[PDB]
Amino acid sequence: IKVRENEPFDVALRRFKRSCEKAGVLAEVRRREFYEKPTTERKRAKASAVKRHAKKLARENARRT
Amino acid sequence: RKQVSDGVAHIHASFNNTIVTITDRQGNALGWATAGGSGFRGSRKSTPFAAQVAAERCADAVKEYGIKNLEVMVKGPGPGRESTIRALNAAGFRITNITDVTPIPHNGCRPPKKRR
Amino acid sequence: PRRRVIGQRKILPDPKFGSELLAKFVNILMVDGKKSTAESIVYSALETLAQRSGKSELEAFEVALENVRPTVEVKSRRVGGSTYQVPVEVRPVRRNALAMRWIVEAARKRGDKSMALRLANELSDAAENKGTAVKKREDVHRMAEANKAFA
Amino acid sequence: FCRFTAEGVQEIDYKDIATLKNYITESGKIVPSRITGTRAKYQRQLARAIKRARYLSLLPYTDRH
RNA sequence: GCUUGAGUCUCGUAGAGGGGGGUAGAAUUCCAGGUGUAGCGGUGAAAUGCGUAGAGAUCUGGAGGAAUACCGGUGGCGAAGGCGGCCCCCUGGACGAAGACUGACGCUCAGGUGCGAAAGCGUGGGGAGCAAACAGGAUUAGAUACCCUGGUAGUCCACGCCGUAAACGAUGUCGACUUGGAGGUUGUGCCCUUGAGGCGUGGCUUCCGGAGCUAACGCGUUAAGUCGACCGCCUGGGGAGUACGGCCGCAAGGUUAAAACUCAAAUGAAUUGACGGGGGCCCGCACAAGCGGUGGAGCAUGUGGUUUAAUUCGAUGCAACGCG
RNA sequence: UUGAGCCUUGAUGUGUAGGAUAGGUGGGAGGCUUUGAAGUGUGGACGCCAGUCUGCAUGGAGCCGACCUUGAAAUACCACC
RNA sequence: CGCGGGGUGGAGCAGCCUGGUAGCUCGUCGGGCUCAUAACCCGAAGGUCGUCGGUUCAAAUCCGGCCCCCGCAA
RNA sequence: AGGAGGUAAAAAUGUGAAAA
């Protein structure tokens, strides 16, 4: 929204956007709602997040290491 | 020309072009910038390099105008977005302010549906 | 060709003085395996470079190499969506061999007088930065640099 | 992950200027409960005070004026 | 007749519950000036569209209609459809600790009745954007196709009407009953409010899974577990949820609902292969880097083609062509 | 105010030869030198990107005309263009 | 009659105010990317640049006159 | 490593009869 710094900037140096969105809300909430499907795409990646959660608990077995 | 100190350059950065005429907060508009008029058609229209060569050719002969530092008001994504005005800072012409006004509504009127 | 690893091997030298890089230049112009013939003529090519310079062996050849020796390499690299030419660095394994392969290719054309008299031209075409070794190299340095976006 | 109503009774109102601006950010966003760890019923009250003070002009609807 | 069923009041809990009325800023954006250079534009690339009167672009000024970014969450409320900024108004239903009150008034339900996404339709408004029907440029062996620039009806509010859906957690409603783990969760009991709580209570909800059950998948205290109340529905597939008739509707159609004939299969779950322009990884000159060339051209062999009494024949997608 | 006509004039003119991006004609031979040079910092009118020219100037007072390859002279000078 | 313009492989369209190239595509031939067909990529036949004449190193182009046509008024 | 940004041209057919 604003990246100025005003005295010592001299370059862009914009990782504020790279750590937040950088194209996020502009390239997604520009159009195309559809009002029906995304929640499943939300939940499937949330199931992947659940799978990311489930795989972190099953780390400690032996692993030969 | 007019020989002033600073100015307010408003950049309408479209998905294809960082359109900016060297403007002011009073409407004084002199120096254009175009991502298609700087050549670079084909795949090169939405390329960052189209904007950067156009932005140096935007600040062309502006030393005679008196203007060195210019208030960038970038609006939209823009093909360059981080080098268009930065090479101008790398060349030396610093920025008084970069106000990246993202025109975010509260989701009012219905938006189109291109790319079916 | 995914994990090819080996140390660099050896080649045949020059029996006049101790020079490995200049002897590597000999093997490139050595074609069809008739090495002895052009090796005698790369010696006369060294002679005819010694008249347009008058300095030395590996200083006349060095000036005939430093105005030709590259630093960068052309390669088509995508960021994922589209292809474009980028100026990327060349490794010195190819670079040392790159410049010497060029003056050989510079003399493979222009076959007006003998091999000495052709490389008379190509070494001074190289010594004064006016050769096909470098003019074609000037095109690569201008086509890659004019479209640098990412590294 | 803070002191809440069970222990830290607190009026979530748009009158108290301090706590009202403690859950906002410069990018035009009320900070969600996913990181701050607030309680949900009070988060709805936390949600309401922003819309309330937006009418009072303590906080705008945008950030650039 | 009492009371654990059920029901009422009390008192607090939360909420896009319903509708009606204002409001505000942003946002594509039209009415134009300022000032201003040649493109804007779009993608696979190009282009019709579009601008030199000065568009894109530029900031200040003016006009709106229609929706509410973050909050927002497998979150809440409602029977479901479905409902989301703010604010007050009339108004829905549920929950909760604990009391007083009538004392089985209940549970389900053919018919009937109401509500009932969107689209469509009727009269009238309203129209900014989006976009059917409709125009064009190209990619194309075809374009009534993606991609691309315009645009009407519709979307719109009010009153009507239709009464269809993957109206679906594909599981009817009611109540009893049967190991748990781990999230979300709001009223709420005790203890040290000592401190981010300890210890529970229940409404409701999410996921993995126990016995059991299930064709299997999986469901799994919100069951598809164990039983009971009662309504509705199916009897192989196509024909067909159509025909005809009744009924309802302005119409579009909805609705109740076959038979003749035809076939001996239709299907569902799960298993092993094959393929995918399904996603990832390892890897052979495949690509990468150069070197040398078949192909050109002058000649030889081989086979086909074209001729001949024979110009044998077998090999002839990859594995035939200096092959036998 | 603009698009033309015409002024005092302001520039500009490469098969090929080339110190020279020379339109023909044309003539005599020094222009030039403090009514302040032969060089260059730098924007840039010219453009067939081949190349000189004008103003300012720390400096500061030098130079070539014919003579030469060219069908033609060398924006040294030059009448009409 | 006169302000103008147009004649270009078998046909269609740029080259013309700037001379140095006689070209862009259709139908025609084959060679290959596919396993076969198709979409596709290259080298080319063939035009008296309307004719004659004149300057120039050289002529489609820059000019003279004539044959043949089309937009308009005598 | 939890969050993130970033990602690729049109490509069609092969009608029959062969399960100890």
From TrEMBL, chain A:
Biased-composition ranges for Basic and acidic residues?
A: 57-65
Q: Which residue ranges does the record annotate as region Disordered?
A: 40-65
Give the record's GO biological process terms: translation
* Transmembrane regions listed in the UniProt entry: none
Q: Where is the composition biased (Basic residues)?
A: 43-56
Please tell me whether the keyword Lipid biosynthesis is annotated for this protein.
no
NCBIfam families hit by this protein: S21p
Q: What is this protein called?
A: Small ribosomal subunit protein bS21
Q: Which gene encodes it?
A: rpsU
From TrEMBL, chain D:
Tell me the protein's name.
Small ribosomal subunit protein bS18
Report the Gene3D superfamilies cross-referenced here. Ribosomal protein S18 (4.10.640.10)
Q: Which domain of life is it from?
A: Bacteria
Q: Which NCBIfam families match?
A: S18
Q: What would be one Pfam family of this protein?
A: Ribosomal_S18
UniProt-listed HAMAP family: Ribosomal_bS18 (MF_00270)
Q: Is Translocase among the key words of this record?
A: no
| One GO MF term attached to the UniProt entry | structural constituent of ribosome
Q: Which family is annotated?
A: Belongs to the bacterial ribosomal protein bS18 family.
Please describe the quaternary structure of this protein. Answer: Part of the 30S ribosomal subunit. Forms a tight heterodimer with protein bS6.
Traced from the root, the source organism's taxonomic lineage reads: Bacteria, Pseudomonadati, Pseudomonadota, Gammaproteobacteria, Enterobacterales
Family matches, as PANTHER family: 30S RIBOSOMAL PROTEIN S18, SMALL RIBOSOMAL SUBUNIT PROTEIN BS18M
- Record the organism: Escherichia coli (strain UMEA 3162-1)
